Structure formats: structure tokens, C-alpha cells
Amino acid sequence: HMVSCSAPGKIYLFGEHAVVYGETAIACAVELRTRVRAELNDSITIQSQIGRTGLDFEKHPYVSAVIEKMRKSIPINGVFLTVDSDIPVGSGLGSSAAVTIASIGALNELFGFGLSLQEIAKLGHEIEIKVQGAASPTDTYVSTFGGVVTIPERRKLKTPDCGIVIGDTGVFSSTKELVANVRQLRESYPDLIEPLMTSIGKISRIGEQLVLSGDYASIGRLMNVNQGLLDALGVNILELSQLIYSARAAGAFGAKITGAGGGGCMVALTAPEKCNQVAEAVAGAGGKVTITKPTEQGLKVD
Amino acid sequence: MVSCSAPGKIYLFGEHAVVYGETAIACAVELRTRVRAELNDSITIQSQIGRTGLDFEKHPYVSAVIEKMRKSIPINGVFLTVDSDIPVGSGLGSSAAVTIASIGALNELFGFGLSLQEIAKLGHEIEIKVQGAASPTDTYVSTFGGVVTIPERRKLKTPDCGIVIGDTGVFSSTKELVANVRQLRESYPDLIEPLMTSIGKISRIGEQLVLSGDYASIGRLMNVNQGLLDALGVNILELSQLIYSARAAGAFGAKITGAGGGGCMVALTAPEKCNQVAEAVAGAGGKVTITKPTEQGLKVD
Ligand SMILES: C[C@@](O)(CCO)CC(=O)[O-]
Ligand SMILES: C[C@@](O)(CCO)CC(=O)[O-]
Ligand SMILES: [K+]
Ligand SMILES: [K+]
């Protein structure tokens, strides 16, 4: 009676920060996944990298919210959930959405809730609102369904036959403060910054055709433009620049911040034959590197 | 023994976008080219590069300055000595300065009687002669000085700030960089042309911030301008390291000055944070020049 589910993380090819101002973005699930194993138990126990708890909204807020929410439809007396992940809690890789979706998947399987993927993505959205007070459905949608998806129209795009090199600066990045900083900048210089958001949106809409045609060189070129605009919005840091420039010099098609910035990770779109060379340059410049690829697979019952 | 000097300049905002009709703001800095002009036997010019006569290869600007000027007042012997504090490249203005200082030093030793605008026009056309083509910007800013808007040429109040210039020592072809931006603009005109508009809008806003002395906001707009230059593809790792080191050490702002691809960045700092910023830039590997803005254009020393 041992069930396991996994859900992937994601990167932004284009358009982070500008979505909340009405602009288009392109997200891409990657083959770094969070796994949740679930078992019948006498009590509620959650174990992850930060230890073992019961219901605990300081250490395990997403998993605990999932259990509380789902126990209202089919009562859950006890359960043992074990979480392990390749997604570092730290950047714009979607670690919160992955454990949320994987937790819902595991309990759906274990207790026979019979939820559809669409229902799961919607429930995962509700959980993140519960935990964060407000949240966009994007993270939990991409983790449920995988692949490449535009935001907010949710067009599904051809998954690139590409390497993806993620470089983690190890700097803790607080998404809400960076989002608030960008808002203050926009407020300070509205006629200047709002067109900058339009440009980021334009990049995503150009990028769509390039994703569909598989022009990874052109995609990387536009990723580099996008990186500049993100730098202009104030969310780049020295460590991110160094990883990004080191990836480019090693032959990446393009490299940029993914997610909120201010720390966290960058992403380098790389031909497969150049993944190691790119990864080595990024590690050499001080980055904790992960080599991965896009995935079409969202929530999976392992 | 006559002595004259003219300064270099940095861009506060607007490089790369002037050629697409947008506004820039330049700032003359207290880095100058001093030429001493005196009478001797033969036309002789001494610089760091060495001692020659009329030589349009080794001393192209000084020699072209002598060539044009003797046509209206004969010079048969000069002893022109040239020293400069101005680093080369990065649009810092070393050629414009050596030009203006020479014109004004020969005009002081000999006759001529030029006006300041007269000085600017001859310097600009001397650059035309030597480089083939040339913008009047560098020669005007070197002559009049202070803070100058481009192209409207309005003067603005000199900010009371430190100016840290960090040289990456990386060489870059300005013609090749300008062409790469032009190509990118042609590839994605609907995307890149609005970025050039944004650079101009920064200059329009920054003009008001210079007038009010809001150095903090000037720096913030410098940091936005730098992201746009990075988006246009003219940034590199060494420029970024210097720029972020200056910001973390308290600069109001830091950005590329000039064409990019290498060359120099500039940091605007409070006067009391200037050596702190300079030390951080040097520790990031930059070749640092510490300076400040200058009201003074061409000055008879
Ligand atoms: C920075 C942001 O745009 C994405 C962070 O991954 C925040 C958001 O869109 O909700
Ligand atoms: C890129 C550019 O605007 C700055 C070089 O000084 C080119 C020019 O002004 O001639
Ligand atoms: K959790
Ligand atoms: K120069």
C-alpha cells in the first residue's frame, strides 16, 4: 500500500515579472521533480529534507494544507508522506508547486479521490492561495501538465530538443520583495517602465514562433535580450551575471535569470553536445550546477 | 610657453540611441589633455608615443590641427608637447581633447583670435579629416564642458558627485559594436526600436533630475540604462563585475559609458563615497581612474 507520485519543476524561457502587468510569458517544465510517497499510518506524519513533523505549517505548510483540504472530502485519519526533491528551495524552479501537486497526486492515488488532472491543478492553485494568501495558477498548472506553456493563454508549445543548464548562485531570493521592488520602480517611472514590460511581452510572442519552429539559436538570442530587460528592472545580481556570462562564453544558445531574480538560479539553453562544457564553466564561475532537459511529463504516478 | 587643456567626458545616459534620433546626456570630467605650445626651429610634436615632426601617421590630430590652421596664419616652428590624463577608448574623448587643446594652444601662442564656438567647429572638422567621418558631440563637449544634452546642446547644472571610471582593459571595435546593434534592430524592429525609445525617455527624465540635483534618482536611471545596454548586447562579464562592485560599495549608479563590448564603465558617487567605490572597482579587477565633473571646457592654463 505504498504509493508514489512526482511532479516537475519549471523554468521561464521568457516573461517573468511582466505577467502580472498583463504581458505574455513562456514557461517550461524540466526534468527535476519532487517525489512524494504516501502510506497508510496511525497518525499524520510528514518527512522531508527539513525533518519529520505532523501537521506543521511552519515546516511543511503546503503538504499540511493539502492534507487538511483533501481530508474534508474523504476523511484522512493518518498517513505518512515522505518528500524528496531535486528542486532546490531557492529560485524560480517551482519547488512549492511541485510538492503541492505531487502531494495531491499521492493522496488521490492512496485514498481513491479519483481527481482529474484539471481538478488537481485547480486544487493545487487553491492550496497555494491558502498558504501564500494570494497566488497565480501558473505554477501548479505547469507542474500538473508539464511541457512548454504560454502564460496566460496556456497555449502548449513544441518541447525543445535541448539541454538546459541551471546555475544556482546559492543566494536566497525572496520573491515578494523583488516583486514589490519592481512595482515601486514602475510607480516611480511609469512612462519609462511600463513600455519596458511591453517589450518583455513582445519577446515572449516572438519567442512562441521560434519555439514552434525549433530555432534554439534565435530563442537563446531573445533570452539574452530578456536578461537585459530583467537587469534593467533591478532584479539581477553579480552572481547571476557571472553564471550567465560564463554559460554564454562556453557555447550556450542563451542564458538568463529564471523566476524572481535577486539571487536564485539562471538558466542556459544549450545544445546537448555543449551541456558539460557549459555546466563546467558555470561551476567554475561559482555556480551549483544542474544539467537537465524540458519534459512533457507533468504529474506522474511512479 | 603657452599651455592649454581640454577635458574628456562620460555619458550619463543615452549612448547608442543618439544615432537613432534619441537624446543623450554627456558630462565633461576633470580628465584633461594639456598641450604646451612654444616657438622652436622646426615643427616638432612630442607625446608619450615620442617625438616627431609634422606626422599625420603618429600625431594625426596635432598634425592635422597644424595643417588646417597655418593656412590662415603661418606657423613654421612649434614645440607642441602633449600629456593626457584621459584613458583611451570608451568614448572618453581622448582624440577630441587632444584636438581642442591643440587648436587653443596654437591660437594662444600665435594669432588667430577664435571664438569658443569657432573652436568647436574647427575641432569637429579636424576629427572629420582624421577619422573620415565624425560626430560634433565629442568636440563640443570638450570645448564648452559641464553637462550637455545631445543633440539639443542645452547646458545643465554640474552635479556635485564623484565619478569613478573603471577600465576593463578589454578592447572592442566601436564600429563592430554599432553594427551589431544595427543588425539586432533590423532583425526585430518592433522589439528593439521601442528599447531605443526607452533610452531616450531615460535621458528626458534624467535631464530633470540633473536640474534638481537628485543624484540618487540619476543613479537609479543609470542602472536602468545599463540593463537596456545589456539587452542591446553591448555588455560583457568584466563590465558587469565592475558595475555591480561599484553599486555594492554605495555608488548612486553604474553603467557602461561609450560603446561597450569592453572598455570602461562609470559610477556616479557621493563625493565622500568616491574612494570606497574606487577601491571596490579595483578589487573587482578594474583599472580605476578617480575623477569628477567639470564646468570647465577649454581652459588656457
Ligand atoms: C517573478 C514572477 O513573475 C515569477 C517568479 O517565478 C512572479 C509571478 O509572476 O507571480
Ligand atoms: C555608441 C556611441 O553612441 C557611443 C560611442 O562613444 C557611438 C557614438 O556616439 O558615435
Ligand atoms: K511543505
Ligand atoms: K578616449
Author numbering:
A (entry chain A): 0 to 301
B (entry chain B): 1 to 301
What are the paper's exact sentences on this?
Mevalonate binds to MmMK at the same location and in a similar position as previously observed in the structure of mevalonate-bound LmMK. However, in both chains of the structure mevalonate makes very few direct contacts with the MmMK protein, in contrast with the several contacts between mevalonate and LmMK. However, many of the contacts observed in the LmMK structure are lost in our mevalonate-bound MmMK structure, where the only direct interaction remaining is between the mevalonate C3-hydroxyl group and His16 (MmMK numbering, corresponding to His25 of LmMK). In fact, the β-strand of LmMK that directly interacts with the mevalonate carboxylate is shortened considerably in MmMK such that there are no residues in this region that can reach mevalonate; in place of the LmMK residue Tyr167 that makes a hydrogen bond with mevalonate, MmMK contains Ile150, which is not capable of interacting with mevalonate. Instead of forming direct interactions with the protein, mevalonate bound to MmMK interacts with several ordered water molecules that themselves form hydrogen bonds to the protein. In this way, water molecules form a cage around the substrate to mediate bridging hydrogen bonding interactions with the protein, including with the backbone amide of Val18 as well as the side chains of Lys9, Ser135, and Asp138. Electron density also indicated that two conformations of mevalonate were present in chain B of the mevalonate-bound structure, and occupancy refinement in Phenix yielded occupancies of ~0.5 for both conformers. These two mevalonate conformations differ only in the position of the carboxylate group, which faces the solvent exterior, indicating that this moiety may “swing” into two different orientations at the protein surface. However, the prior mevalonate-bound LmMK structure as well as our mevalonate-bound MmMK structure presented here suggest that this aspartate residue may be too far from mevalonate to directly deprotonate the C5-hydroxyl, with distances of 5.2 and 5.5 Å, respectively.
A key regulatory step in the mevalonate pathway is the ATP-dependent phosphorylation of (R)-mevalonate to (R)-5-phosphomevalonate catalyzed by the enzyme mevalonate kinase (MK), a member of the galacto-/homoserine/mevalonate/phosphomevalonate (GHMP) kinase family. Distributed widely across eukaryotes, bacteria, and archaea, the mevalonate pathway consists of seven enzymes that convert three molecules of acetyl-CoA to isopentenyl pyrophosphate (IPP) and dimethylallyl pyrophosphate (DMAPP), the isomeric, five-carbon precursors to all steroids and isoprenoids. Each MK monomer consists of two domains, where the active site lies on a surface cleft at the interdomain interface. To shed greater light onto the mechanism of MK and to further investigate archaeal MK in particular, we determined the X-ray structures of MmMK bound with the substrate mevalonate and with the product 5-phosphomevalonate.
